[PDB]
Amino acid sequence: TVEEANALLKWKSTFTNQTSSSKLSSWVNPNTSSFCTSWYGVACSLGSIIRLNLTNTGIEGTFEDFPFSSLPNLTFVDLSMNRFSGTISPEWGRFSKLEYFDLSINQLVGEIPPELGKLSNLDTLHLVENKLNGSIPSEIGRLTKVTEIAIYDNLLTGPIPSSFGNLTKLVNLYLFINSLSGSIPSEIGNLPNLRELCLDRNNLTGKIPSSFGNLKNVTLLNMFENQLSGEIPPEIGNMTALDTLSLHTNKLTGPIPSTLGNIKTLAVLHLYLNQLNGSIPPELGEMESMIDLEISENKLTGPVPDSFGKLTALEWLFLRDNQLSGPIPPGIANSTELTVLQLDTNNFTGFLPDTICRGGKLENLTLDDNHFEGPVPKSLRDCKSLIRVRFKGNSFSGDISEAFGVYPTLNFIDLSNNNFHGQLSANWEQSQKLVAFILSNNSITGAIPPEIWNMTQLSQLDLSSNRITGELPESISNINRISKLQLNGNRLSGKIPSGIRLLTNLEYLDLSSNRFSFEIPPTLNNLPRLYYMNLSRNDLDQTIPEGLTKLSQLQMLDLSYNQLDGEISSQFRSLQNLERLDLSHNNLSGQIPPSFKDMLALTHVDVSHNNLQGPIPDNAAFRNAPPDAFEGNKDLCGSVNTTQGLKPCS
């Protein structure tokens, strides 16, 4: 009508920063021939506006001059995705015919007025992604025809009103990302049509109501990231349409209810980051639809039940960071669909089961800091789908070349501190995308296959603390992405290869505790990321090369326990990030360079058991050093009023 149109024009005249590319260019002639056919966002019935849809039209303004008293037939209103600021007026509740009301994705502030409950015909209420605050008014519970309420991503506080139990047609309730508090009202459980209930990311406290067992139609129950407490009520097992139950990151205590096995539709169960205790009920094995079972970061004890072999759709099993113990039953890995088996940080014992990877799809197997033992099952040897294998801290055994097969998609493998023996196979080269190969402190013997150096994606290679022999070849330069190279604690012999000079991504290099002979390569001067270099406990000889003083990022340099001789270069002053320097147990002669006074970052220094003489340089590390940092030298002398076990200088 002319009156409706002119009122909307007056509201439009108040908008700011409007750019005349606006769709509202079409709002000009208030007569019905224009208003009801050509005004953008306006639809009419019998010459009167019933729908106003200005979603995402770049409007900046407020509802201060919205024509509440001039649009009596407003039935659908969508003002979402604009720059409307200010508050929500009580006057919105005078639109008696309103069925659809969306003010989402704006910059609205203030409280939701109770008058919105006067909208007795409302089907959908959407106010998401604003900065609305205060409590949800109890009068919202008068919306007896509403099927969807979404007020997520606001600043709401206070409790969910118990009047929400009167919303008998409610299907979807989305209140996540607020600061709602108090207990969930038990009246929520008596909503017969409810399908989705998302209350996650709030500050709700108290126990989950046992009335939730009356929610026979709910398929989605998200209440993660709250402060819910008490035990999960056994009545939750009567939510027999649930597809996804997420209660993670709460303060729930007590045992997992055995009645969860009653939910035959349940595909996703997230209970992690709670304080759930007791044993895993064997009835959880009866959740026939379960795909994604996550009960990590709890306090569960006892064994994994054999009934997990009935979970034939299982894909993800997260059990890490619990106190589970005992042998694992073959059923735990029996799903042919299993891709992720996460058991780290428990106290499991015994062998891995021969069911593992029987379906050919297992990707990530993580077992760190359990007590597993025994040989690797041949089905894991043959598991070509593996991506991430973490065995650190267990006691698996056997010949490493027989234990493991070929893994084309392997990304990461850590076998640290296990009990494998034998020689490394060239088969590892087939993991062309492997970025970490960690085999520390096994009983590996024999040579490093030359094919290892063609694993050009490697970033971390740790073969430390084995009994590996042989010489490192110049083709070590081929691993050019290597950042952490740990070959320490082996029996490697021959000279350190000059090819290390080309490993310009190196940050951490440990070749110590080997049988390396001959000189430190003089070309190790261009490793601009190298902060750690340990060549200690070898048979390295001749002089310390000046190129090392160009490794500007070095923080620790340990060359101790070698046969190095000659003088300490005064160019050490250039290592301005050097914090720890160990040259002890060598054959170094002459004076400690006075240029050490330049090394203000140095905190730890040891030059003991050399053939050095003369005064001690003036820097904090030398002043703070204990007498054994200097003992065993030829003619060192100190200064009075600083005891370090030296005869004073003349």
Binding site: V128, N172, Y174, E196, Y272, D292
Partner: peptide
């Protein structure tokens, strides 16, 4: 504009 929330895996 309205989505149900999504629980993330651990």
């Amino acid at each position: 504009p309205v989505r149900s929330s999504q629980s993330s895996q651990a």
